[PDB]
Design a protein around this nucleic acid. Structure first.
Ligand SMILES: Nc1ccn([C@H]2C[C@H](O)[C@@H](COP(=O)(O)OP(=O)(O)OP(=O)(O)O)O2)c(=O)n1
Ligand SMILES: Nc1ccn([C@H]2C[C@H](O)[C@@H](COP(=O)(O)OP(=O)(O)OP(=O)(O)O)O2)c(=O)n1
Ligand SMILES: OC[C@H]1O[C@@](CO)(O[C@H]2O[C@H](CO)[C@@H](O)[C@H](O)[C@H]2O)[C@@H](O)[C@@H]1O
Ligand SMILES: [Mg+2]
Length: 579
DNA sequence: CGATCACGC
DNA sequence: ACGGCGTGATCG
């Protein structure tokens, strides 16, 4: 049992200068979502407040907004954004249990207070699905049941703060929480709430044109197949290609015949249809995902989309982006790239500004592996893909063709993360003997990288985990497994996580540094998006010459490595034009 | 619901 | 079995 006051009014003792606070949003997507209840636990007791009451009370709202009144929460970004949608500011969050749990072990997939609690054998709180129900049974329960749940969550946060901080400190991860992840949560909240403005007319025009083209390509595909079928069914397509047209079966998966883009390209010498199928799939993706899917989530009266950056999901410390995902907007092909013309500034006479790290992962690799040859390339800003091409093809610089550089690109990206001769040969559609030579030559050229791959795997085996530059960890209990497949996957994770995760660390610290400076010089410029190794902003056009100086320097000096960090930048009237 | 396929880093 | 991390449309 747990005593608590189900309050009908806000009182002075509820406004202490340290509390656990719960501002409950039950909708998975919290943008413009109902707040269903509020709990406060502090030195003076435990309290449930109806939102209708607390959020209309001047003293409570002032307390929420006072940075000197410290709050411990779980997913303070959820609450801060839901409050923003109700026009209320939340300040003074000093501890976020979700971010603490994520840092202690991202593999646990902690997604509610109960799951965090279990890490410390705290059982005096129910799981959120046990109270609200799963999927179609999802509902806010009767007030006494809700109140007790919210109070129990607040009480768990209250008790768990110290145990979590003690373990983070033990791990030398406490500053990762308090100086990096928690300040970032604030910054992301602002990004999600501001949203990104979309030219829906343009998307609607594109959609109309795509539907025409889809129809044309579809009938042409039925013509060359001599049958009608569901092209979006890999199974039905496989029957057509490998049974009706008797094309060679190049790859069989655990389920059937592969019709992947790689396979279809390799089939091009056998039938023209595969080019049409590839074209259909590319148009089809644009339509369903980046036209239909985008327009479904745009808010019609403001024309904004409000993504959610999940800060506590990826195993390497990257962010993810959902509903809509704004981290996979097309760029590689010109047709898809045009989607970016529909991403526009939120005010007139504002511009989109985009800045990206040049090969952050390879630079981080150079730093961590301490390979002399790789480090010198970045110190001297030589094209690393051309350099590798020269080494693996054994030619001079002028003899490197664009196709050779593309092969070298896959070599540079793949080898340090454990690509084999088979994977390289399959990806590049080249001789497996030649792929194996590529690998031998790469390692004889960057021997520090070979030593890194050996050393980090051995460290993972000995410690049970790998670490990034700013002390993020990933545990790899699979790494000393007898079984080749299980062990091998773990070994490749040991090679990759310190590099991808350190890159994540660097850009997160860059975001925090940047917001400080923008707030410092009182510039209207603000962040809209992060795309793993790039930051996207909007600002009044007058602010562009400043941003060209400020943004790249802040990003490049976020950390100091054994090699320089390099940032490119562009701006224009749309995201497309910021090229 | 887990796989397949396409998009990004 | 045979580079890493994601989201999501779509299928059977
Ligand atoms: N108690 C600690 C110590 C370190 N770190 C992480 C976050 C730091 O940003 C990173 C850097 O490690 P250092 O021990 O080198 O600390 P700093 O470099 O931040 O301090 P300084 O460089 O001023 O010595 O390690 C942490 O999370 N918690
Ligand atoms: N198959 C891929 C493609 C890309 N990336 C990562 C590494 C790259 O640094 C980053 C950006 O991709 P680019 O193709 O732009 O890589 P570069 O900028 O190095 O190539 P280029 O010099 O041709 O722009 O995404 C990856 O890991 N695997
Ligand atoms: O609010 C983000 C935060 O909530 C969690 C659950 O604690 O995820 C929920 O919210 C996400 C954003 O809407 C959804 O994508 C997800 O499906 C839902 O469980 C955390 O995972 C996340 O960090
Ligand atoms: Mg590039």
């Amino acid at each position: 049992k747990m005593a608590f006051t189900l309050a009908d009014r806000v009182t002075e003792e509820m406004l202490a200068d340290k509390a656990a606070l719960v501002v409950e949003v039950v909708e998975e997507n919290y943008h413009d979502a109902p707040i269903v209840g509020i709990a406060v636990v502090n030195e003076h007791g435990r309290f449930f407040l109806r939102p209708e009451t607390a959020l209309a009370d001047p003293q409570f709202v002032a307390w929420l907004g006072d940075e000197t009144k410290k709050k411990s929460m779980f997913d303070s970004k959820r609450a801060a954004v839901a409050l923003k949608w109700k026009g209320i500011e939340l300040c003074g969050v000093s501890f976020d249990l979700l971010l603490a749990a994520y840092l202690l072990d991202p593999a646990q997939g902690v997604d509610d207070v109960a799951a965090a609690a279990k890490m410390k054998q705290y059982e005096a709180v129910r799981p959120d699905e046990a109270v609200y129900g799963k999927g179609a049974k999802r509902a806010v329960p009767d007030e006494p049941v809700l109140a007790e749940h919210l109070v129990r969550k607040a009480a768990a946060i209250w008790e768990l703060e110290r145990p979590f901080l003690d373990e983070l400190r033990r791990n030398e991860q406490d500053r990762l929480l308090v100086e990096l992840e928690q300040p970032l949560s604030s910054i992301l909240a602002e990004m999600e709430f501001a949203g990104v403005k979309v030219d829906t007319k343009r998307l609607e025009q594109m959609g109309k044109e795509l539907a025409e083209q889809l129809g044309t390509v579809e009938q042409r595909i039925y013509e060359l197949a001599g049958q009608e079928f569901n092209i979006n069914s890999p199974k039905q397509l496989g029957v057509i290609l490998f049974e009706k047209l008797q094309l060679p079966v190049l790859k069989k998966t655990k389920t059937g015949y592969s019709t992947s883009a790689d396979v279809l390209e390799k089939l091009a010498p056998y039938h023209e249809i595969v080019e049409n199928i590839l074209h259909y799939r590319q148009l089809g993706k644009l339509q369903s995902t980046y036209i239909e899917g985008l327009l479904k989530v745009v808010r019609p009266a403001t024309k904004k989309v409000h993504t959610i950056f999940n800060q506590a999901l990826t195993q390497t410390g990257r962010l993810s982006s959902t509903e809509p995902n704004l981290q996979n907007i097309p760029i590689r092909l010109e047709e898809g790239r045009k989607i970016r013309q529909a991403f526009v500034p939120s005010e007139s006479d504002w511009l989109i500004f985009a800045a990206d790290y040049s090969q952050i992962e390879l630079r981080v690799l150079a730093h961590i592996a301490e390979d002399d040859n790789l480090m010198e390339a970045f110190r001297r800003d030589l094209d690393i893909h051309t350099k590798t091409a020269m080494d693996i093809f054994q030619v001079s610089e002028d003899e490197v063709t664009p196709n050779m550089r593309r092969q070298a690109k896959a070599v540079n990206f793949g080898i340090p993360y454990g690509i084999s001769d088979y994977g390289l040969a399959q990806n590049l559609n080249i001789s497996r003997k030649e792929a194996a030579e590529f690998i031998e030559r790469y390692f004889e050229s960057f021997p520090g990288v070979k030593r890194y791959m050996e050393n980090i795997v051995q460290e993972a085996k000995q410690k049970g985990y790998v670490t990034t530059l700013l002390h993020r960890r990933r545990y790899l209990p699979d790494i000393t497994s007898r079984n080749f497949n299980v062990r091998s996957f773990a070994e490749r994770m040991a090679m990759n996580t310190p590099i991808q995760g350190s890159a994540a660390d660097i850009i997160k610290k860059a975001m925090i540094d940047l917001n400080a400076r923008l707030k410092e010089e009182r510039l209207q410029a603000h962040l809209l998006l992060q795309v793993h190794d790039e930051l996207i902003l909007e600002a009044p056009k007058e602010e562009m010459e400043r941003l060209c100086r400020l943004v790249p320097e802040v990003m490049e000096q976020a950390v100091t490595l054994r090699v320089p960090l390099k940032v490119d930048y562009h701006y224009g009237s749309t995201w497309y034009d910021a090229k």
